[PDB]
Amino acid sequence: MKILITGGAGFIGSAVVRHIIKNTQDTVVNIDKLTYAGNLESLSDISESNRYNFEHADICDSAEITRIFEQYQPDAVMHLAAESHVDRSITGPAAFIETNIVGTYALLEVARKYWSALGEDKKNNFRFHHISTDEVYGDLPHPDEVENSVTLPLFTETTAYAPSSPYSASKASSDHLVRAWRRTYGLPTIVTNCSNNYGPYHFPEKLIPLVILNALEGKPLPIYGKGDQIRDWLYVEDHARALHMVVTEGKAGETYNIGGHNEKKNLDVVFTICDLLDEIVPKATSYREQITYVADRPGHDRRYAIDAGKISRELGWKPLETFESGIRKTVEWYLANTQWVNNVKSGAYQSWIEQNYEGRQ
Template sequence: MKTYLVTGGAGFIGSNFVQFVLANHDGVRVVNVDALTYAGNLENLAPVKDDPRYTFVHADICDRARMRALIAEYDPTYVVNFAAESHVDRSIENPSVFAVTNVLGTISLLDAVRDAWTSESGPGDHRYLQVSTDEVYGTLSLDEPDAFFRESTPLSPHSPYSASKASADMFVLAYADTFGLPVNITRCSNNYGPYQFPEKLIPLMIHNAMAHEPLPVYGDGLNVRDWLYVEDHCKAIDLVLERGRVGEVYNVGGHNERNNMYIVERIISELSGRLGDPAISSDLIRHVEDRKGHDRRYGIAPDKIYDELGWEPETPFEDGIGRTISWYLGNQRWVDHVTSGSYRQYFESMYGNRRILSEE
């Protein structure tokens, strides 16, 4: 029986991955390790909570003794590290939290698997996979639409968040070189889909539009991201675990570059049409003062993962955003739970005092 030990499995991408593995593999066990910080939510795992193949462990990856004990207890075939502070805005407000979780937490996990997998017989079939981000590469120009991030692109992070992820990536590769750990890194573009916490662009806009609240758009709204439907990402990670070359980095992109204004306007159009609500309109858009160090464009070339593993994104953005909106409309109780209390305070702290540049 293969055992997947998934850290951060109560978060957005992690919970989707846990569900994907259990739905697509027989004879496996999934151990979900999560500290349940603000974005970790066990409601994300409701569809699998009673599955006998699934185990939840409440623990922080920074707890070195606990990580060693868990690796020894479950002897995982695969360790997949999703656990991370991941929101750029929060990293600007408090960079040190990102250094602790994303860097020191990764080192704690690497030390745990090093202790367990270092022996005369070698690591066997074990594999450690670090889930990273295209943000470690920095930014691309809007004037060069044919330029893309490749695995060979030098790392040039521009925010505390991306700097912490780049640092973690370097430690993963260093542990592979120094200790012979069997590792992979996947660097993905912007994910969207079910269970995403509404601090990120798409769920934030869906939530606010439905409530007839302002839709805050940074700057001119022309920043471009490559959008990747979360299920496509889960498939890529699973392929890398099973067939990826040890020690390699794989970029995972969606072939769906869209600017933020297009995203917001698409959400408005979809919601107003479905709900028959004329109050959901571009009148809700507020262009607010841009965040510090806001990268202009991300674009991934996923050629390597296609050439080696046959993976390519299956979900066009226009299909994926429709499925995402359907999920949020059908899971209002989940939305109500995650947007109550401290979330309202966070929203006000992020956007309440930002200078409004213009209204649509």
């Protein structure tokens, strides 16, 4: 099967591309604009494959995207291209509205026209897989807000949308467009909403990779508020396996939440990374001494937790890593890939760090 993937040069996208080329017989055409988050180095291990092709393009460029669809004749689409950082969306929402909402709209129109003109066979089997986030569901009650006996709620596929940030509002909106295109035009769409991802090739602006790199560089490890906020951590390679399973076996019109049921408090994750580094790269003092509390994120969602029961019983997907095994693999990966890390740390990255962290709130 020929799969057209947008955002394949990103964190999760590159994992999807590497997985497809290494463990399947499908082919891939990767469309990526190469923003600050795009990195062809993350695809170095498969870029030479005859089953892989790269197209440097913007999903908003309708004419070019249209041409690419006609050239490669994809059997399915996996849409991961997006602006993904909540903190960047707070100070610069425009890029999120543009890429996440308008860009998904532009891609949907190209896909709709393409799909509509396909032969009976190919048309019935075509699939448009929209990759999304658990953040569209809003925030969940926190353990410190309920009785120490009551069972905390989880995000299910029927949980009402209630996005808190420009980023999550942008993704929620994109999800709606995908479903409306399905209901109105019949386009065979599938939507997945996954918990936080972590692992190899993660851009150093998200919690885990930022903490790992800052720790090694002797810099502060910024904790928003009290660090008691909760996130559900899924290893990126596990997400990638789930995504290929969904695009291949998922049912059109369905939604599948993806997660490994691994709720963790931010501070706990940071301590875990620090202890791992104290063990692997010991120095005079503990990396813990770099933990630093800083002003909280405006509108911060205090708890995300995904119920992946549906995808488990319907597709049989199960994560292979545990947070313990995954976080160690992640720390080990960054220590073994200083080449990749040094390249992704440009003056642009430093400017973002100064913008979001120095003189912070």
